Structure formats: C-alpha cells, structure tokens
Amino acid sequence: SGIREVILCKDQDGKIGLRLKSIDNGIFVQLVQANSPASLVGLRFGDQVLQINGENCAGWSSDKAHKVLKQAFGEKITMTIRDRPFERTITMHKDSTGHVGFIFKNGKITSIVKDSSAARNGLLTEHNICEINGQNVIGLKDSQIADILSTSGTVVTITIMPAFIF
C-alpha cells in the first residue's frame, strides 16, 4: 500500500543529501539533510528504497548503494520507496504531573515507567523516537525532544522504530 515513486535532481555540487543503510538484504534511508534534494521528495528516515534508476536494491551493501548515488546521471535519480516499513504509532495521555511515562537516551527509549500511559499502551524499549504529533525529532537533542513533548498537549502520538534501523 505504502509504495511511491520519487524523482531526485542532484545539487550544484552533485549530491542529494542522503545516506543509505543495508538491513535484512534491503536498503533503508539512514539520514536526510534538511533543504536537500532528498528532503524535497519527502524521503524520511527508515523509508525502504526498493529500486534506484531501474535496479532493485535487494541485497546491496551500504557501500554499493552509496557508490550508485555518486556514479548516477545529474537531474535524473529515480527511486521506488516503501514508506517506513518498521514504523509504529503509539498514542499516550499525560498524567496529572504532565508525564507519559518513559525514559530515553539519545532519542532511544530505555525504560517504561510503572503505571503510566506508556505502560498502558505497551510502549517498547530499544526503539527510537521518530516523531511527536507528526513533528520530526530524529537527530535533535534529548532536551529539544523533551521540550517538544512538554508542548504537545495531553494527547501525545509518537512514531517509533526498532533501534536496529538507526
């Protein structure tokens, strides 16, 4: 269902502002720089790249994917994407002290507080926080993540992904 096609146009330098990673004989988006050709086509962290310029990424190493992006042909980089296959959404409600009930280090969930909304909704550890109420938190400081949560109202919708994606 979550399949889409994107056409990327290479920068003045000849770059696209994207880093790819090999996971389970597939290729996934590892990093998207803001205001880059990749950000322009809605490429998100964790998105699976199915093919690049008419070639299946199946079983390509991170090295091969990186080389393919460099040895391309200018204004024409074609991709078929499967939207964040390991993405999950968890809705939580703040308590009276304004907590959802989880602890995190470098955007990764490490513990779930007992008798909290995160406990109730079965939030998992060893999972990276991707978004809070649709806003991207990937690669922000833990304090920037915390400040965003504190300002997200009482209903907090988080997008997560297992740690092995990052």
Place this chain on the structure above:
Amino acid sequence: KGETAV
C-alpha cells in the same frame, strides 16, 4: 545528560 524522563 544521561537519561531524560518524560
């Protein structure tokens, strides 16, 4: 910073 609780 070590662990952030939210």
